[PDB]
Amino acid sequence: QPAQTIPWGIERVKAPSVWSITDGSVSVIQVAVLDTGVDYDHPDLAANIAWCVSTLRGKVSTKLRDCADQNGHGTHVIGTIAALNNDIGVVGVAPGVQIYSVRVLDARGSGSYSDIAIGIEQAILGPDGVADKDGDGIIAGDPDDDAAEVISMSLGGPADDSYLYDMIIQAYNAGIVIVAASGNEGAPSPSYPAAYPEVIAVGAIDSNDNIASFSNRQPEVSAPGVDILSTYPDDSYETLMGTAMATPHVSGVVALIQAAYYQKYGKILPVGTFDDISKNTVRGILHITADDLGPTGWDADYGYGVVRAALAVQAALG
Numbered sequence: 285q286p287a288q289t290i291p292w293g294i295e296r297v298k299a300p301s302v303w304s305i306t307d308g309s310v311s312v313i314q315v316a317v318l319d320t321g322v323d324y325d326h327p328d329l330a331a332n333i334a335w336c337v338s339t340l341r342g343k344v345s346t347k348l349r350d351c352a353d354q355n356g357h358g359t360h361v362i363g364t365i366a367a368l369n370n371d372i373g374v375v376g377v378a379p380g381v382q383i384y385s386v387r388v389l390d391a392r393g394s395g396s397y398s399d400i401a402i403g404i405e406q407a408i409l410g411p412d413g414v415a416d417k418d419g420d421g422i423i424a425g426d427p428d429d430d431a432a433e434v435i436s437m438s439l440g441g442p443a444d445d446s447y448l449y450d451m452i453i454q455a456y457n458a459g460i461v462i463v464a465a466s467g468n469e470g471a472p473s474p475s476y477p478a479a480y481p482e483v484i485a486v487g488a489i490d491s492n493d494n495i496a497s498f499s500n501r502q503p504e505v506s507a508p509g510v511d512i513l514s515t516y517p518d519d520s521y522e523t524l525m526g527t528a529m530a531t532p533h534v535s536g537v538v539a540l541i542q543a544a545y546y547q548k549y550g551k552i553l554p555v556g557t558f559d560d561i562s563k564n565t566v567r568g569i570l571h572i573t574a575d576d577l578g579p580t581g582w583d584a585d586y587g588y589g590v591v592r593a594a595l596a597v598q599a600a601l602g
């Protein structure tokens with residue numbers, strides 16, 4: 285295996301200086317990544333893989349072969365969130381965060397809407413299949429449950445499916461932060477599910493801090509999405525580009541906020557809303573600590589700006 289390198293995007297979102305506070309290894313926190321599957325035994329991933337599930341064709345299955353990445357995309361996205369900080373490969377934004385790999389996309393990267401809807405439900409129910417096992421009314425941020433705190437969706441399309449949208453509303457109202465790619469058509473507004481008001485739409489910058497021209501406009505925040513090196517099957521590494529690559533940077537920063545807030549207070553922040561500019565919710569903190577590029581304030585290119593984990597966490601803890 286090759287010696288560890290830090291991909292430029294990990295440095296760009298200011299993640300490494302947070303790790304001494306937390307690398308996301310606060311046991312209550314998990315990130316669900318709804319994608320093509322994962323290379324579950326990849327040496328730079330395996331120890332962070334808490335659950336590997338499939339919802340393809342209606343069936344929930346944890347058979348390894350059912351849950352394994354047959355495309356490469358999911359393994360790449362997951363390594364950007366949580367590739368381990370060790371002597372090999374790469375390193376994620378939250379290199380100690382627990383991952384749920386929820387395969388909702390086939391070998392080609394296509395998914396049906398009820399498969400993705402079911403994926404969202406699985407992220408809430410978690411490996412034990414029960415939402416609120418101890419009946420205390422708390423799901424996200426409850427160490428007695430195994431619900432994810434972040435659902436990351438590096439996928440999207442022009443289609444708005446109400447069944448999937450209902451699942452999103454359920455997760456959001458459970459206190460789960462939802463993050464998704466704005467899309468790759470240079471379009472005037474984000475694909476769904478990014479375009480849902482409950483969801484953080486993520487646009488893609490390059491290494492010069494320019495918005496990538498394929499990045500769909502009107503995102504909520506933006507993140508590294510060009511020349512992104514991460515993990516790839518089989519026990520390998522590969523470089524990809526797209527708002528799918530920017531998304532996991534934002535999910536990692538969210539995992540760091542919630543892990544650091546929990547470590548200090550014994551609880552997590554509310555998700556918040558698009559318009560939030562206070563330090564009282566996850567999204568408010570993302571918006572006000574982002575590097576504001578382009579026109580001052582929120583803009584159609586960068587949204588609120590480039591996410592910055594070191595400032596986000598400082599805002600969350602102060």
Ligand SMILES: [Ca+2]
Nearest residue numbers: 312314430431
């Ligand atoms: Ca949890």
Ligand SMILES: [Ca+2]
Nearest residue numbers: 323325326519
């Ligand atoms: Ca492997």
Ligand SMILES: [Ca+2]
Nearest residue numbers: 368370372374
């Ligand atoms: Ca590594």
Ligand SMILES: [Ca+2]
Nearest residue numbers: 409410414430
């Ligand atoms: Ca559960």
Ligand SMILES: [Ca+2]
Nearest residue numbers: 416420422426
């Ligand atoms: Ca509970």
Ligand SMILES: [Ca+2]
Nearest residue numbers: 418420426428
């Ligand atoms: Ca509890």
Ligand SMILES: [Ca+2]
Nearest residue numbers: 577578579581
């Ligand atoms: Ca701006």
